[PDB]
Amino acid sequence: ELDRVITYEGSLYSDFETSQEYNLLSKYAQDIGVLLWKDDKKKKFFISKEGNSQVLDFAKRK
Amino acid sequence: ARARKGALVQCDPSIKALILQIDAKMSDIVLEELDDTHLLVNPSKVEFVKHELNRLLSKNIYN
């Protein structure tokens, strides 16, 4: 269905060195309600434009 | 470790296929295939894609 196509602005995260790093940031993003999509097998996730700065800030504080 | 800006598009498999057809024709639309129901698209092309999908589906002479 076309009526069900949804788009979102934001940022795609990738290039994680470890499963633990990927899941840490993925979990934090879910906790604060800004994670829109993820794929554990690729270690990627997509964060809303609104939430991106908080996720970056958390990453830089670890 | 790396982040890139884009537009996430969530859609059914048949719509994903149609957007890929749009990209093949016009280029510079799809940045990444993410999974069976998700694409990363050029943010400046989102409205184009939505309009084109509406035309493809609504103006089909076999409707």
Which helix (H) or strand (E) is B58 found in, with range?
helix B46-58
Contact A5 B54 (CB under 8 A): no
| Per-position DSSP letters for A6-62, written without gaps between them | EEEEEEEEE--S-HHHHHHHHHHHHHTT-EEEEETTTTEEEEETTTHHHHHHHHTT-
Q: Contact A14/A47 with Cβ under 8 angstroms?
A: no
Residue carrying structure tokens 């554990």: A40
Q: Note the resolution in Å, 1 decimal.
A: 1.8
Cα separation of A43 and B7, whole Å?
18
Does residue A36 belong to the interface with chain B, where contact is any CB pair within 8 Å?
A: yes
Cα separation of A31 and B20, whole Å?
33
Residues of chain B in contact with residue A2, where contact means CB-CB under 8 angstroms, are: 15, 53-54, 57
Angle between helical axes of A52-59 and A19-31 (0-180°, round to 10): 140
| Per-position DSSP letters for B4-54, written without gaps between them | EEEEEEE--HHHHHHHHHHHHHH-SSEEEEEETTEEEE-GGGHHHHHHHHH
Residue ranges covered by each domain of chain B: 1-63
Q: In sequence order, what are the residues at sequence separation of 6 or more whose Cβ sits closer than 8 angstroms to the Cβ of residue A27?
A: none
Three-state secondary structure call for residue B1: coil
Q: Contact A44/B34 with Cβ under 8 angstroms?
A: yes
Domains of chain A, start order: 1-62 (3.30.70.2610)
Residues of chain A in contact with residue B3, where contact means CB-CB under 8 angstroms, are: 11-14, 47, 52, 56
Cα separation of B34 and A19, whole Å?
18
Contact B8 A37 (CB under 8 A): yes
Nearest to B13 by CA among B31, B32, B39: B39
Check: CATH 1.10.287.1080 for B1-63? no
- Note the Cα B15 to chain centre separation in Å: 8
